[PDB]
């Protein structure tokens, strides 16, 4: 398959060079895979999801996404125009309120929930979880993200938008999960991107066009927008039988784009997510 005039983030994942505008992906598009989107929830009624998005849990009182953050990142995972795993099943767990805030107890309970409701769903190819939140260091949310990864889920988390070492932030500094940095249009490190040895992979995170609440589309930039690129890539890769949730992150790093990024500090990886699809 091939999508013309794609968002720069989609085309970059299917490329060895920046600047391309066509996104090349296998026709499977990650069908049979599930990606839990742990954010502000998802607006399931968006025409870009096509019944593939679903609100399965809210830790507030309404499954609405009255923020737009969670609908944007879920769009990058597997919507029609802006998703990398265009046929995946999107499950929306709402740990962030309509302001983008969220207590660690709520974020932890959301990860503990995904690991259980995973067994109540039909995901033959496997399960993915994209946690594009980020707070200060916590031993317990690092522990909760590891429990999600150990339970059989590919866990992609945001590196943080602090321009510092991601070792001070959670769940980013959890070694078991996949910490995703953000890159911009020209294969530079995003000016907000966290770095450090904790990061496992980079993704398009600057000016990422995706869906938005109210049936709209808009671009926002953050490592929280680069994370869904790796979530959908892991989903799209596990559908191909190329990798397993337990090692999707390491497989993406093995088959990434080596040394293409600039502004990478010393000790941080220089890998850009690459689906390696060749038609
Ligand atoms: Ca998001
Ligand atoms: Ca490297």
Swiss-Prot record:
The keyword Protease appears for this protein: yes
Active site: 39 (charge relay system), 69 (charge relay system), 224 (charge relay system)
Reactions it catalyzes: Hydrolysis of keratin, and of other proteins with subtilisin-like specificity. Hydrolyzes peptide amides
Disulphide connectivity of cysteines: 34-123, 178-249
Keyword terms, alphabetized: Calcium, Disulfide bond, Hydrolase, Metal-binding, Protease, Serine protease, Signal, Zymogen
GO-annotated molecular function: metal ion binding; serine-type endopeptidase activity
Residues binding Ca(2+) 2: 16, 260
Residue span(s) of domain Peptidase S8: 7-279
Cofactor note: Binds 2 calcium ions per subunit.
UniProt function note: Hydrolyzes keratin at aromatic and hydrophobic residues.
Annotated family: Belongs to the peptidase S8 family.
Name listed for the protein in its UniProt record: Proteinase K
Range covered out of full length: 106 to 384 of 384
């Amino acid at each position: 398959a091939a999508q013309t005039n794609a968002p720069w983030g989609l085309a970059r994942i299917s490329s060895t060079s920046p600047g391309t505008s066509t996104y090349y992906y296998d026709e499977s598009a990650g069908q049979g895979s599930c990606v839990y989107v742990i954010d502000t929830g998802i607006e399931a009624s968006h025409p870009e999801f096509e019944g593939r998005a679903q609100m399965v849990k809210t830790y507030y009182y309404s499954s609405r996404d009255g923020n737009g953050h969670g609908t944007h990142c879920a769009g990058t995972v597997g919507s029609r125009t802006y998703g990398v795993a265009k046929k995946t099943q999107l499950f929306g767990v709402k740990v962030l309120d309509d302001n983008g805030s969220g207590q660690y107890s709520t974020i932890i309970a959301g990860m503990d929930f995904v690991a259980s409701d995973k067994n109540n769903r039909n995901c033959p190819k496997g399960v993915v979880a994209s946690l594009s939140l980020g707070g200060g260091y916590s031993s317990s949310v690092n522990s909760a993200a590891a429990r999600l990864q150990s339970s059989g889920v590919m866990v992609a988390v945001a590196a943080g938008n602090n321009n510092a070492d991601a070792r001070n932030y959670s769940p980013a500094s959890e070694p078991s999960v996949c910490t995703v940095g953000a890159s911009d249009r020209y294969d530079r490190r995003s000016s907000f991107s966290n770095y450090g040895s904790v990061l496992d992979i980079f993704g398009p995170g600057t000016d990422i066009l995706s869906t938005w609440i109210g049936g709209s589309t808009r671009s926002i930039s953050g490592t929280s927008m680069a994370t869904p690129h790796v979530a959908g890539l892991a989903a799209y890769l596990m559908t191909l039988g190329k990798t397993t949730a337990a090692s999707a992150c390491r497989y993406i790093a093995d088959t990434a784009n080596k040394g293409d990024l600039s502004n990478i500090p010393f000790g941080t990886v220089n890998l850009l997510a690459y689906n390696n699809y060749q038609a």
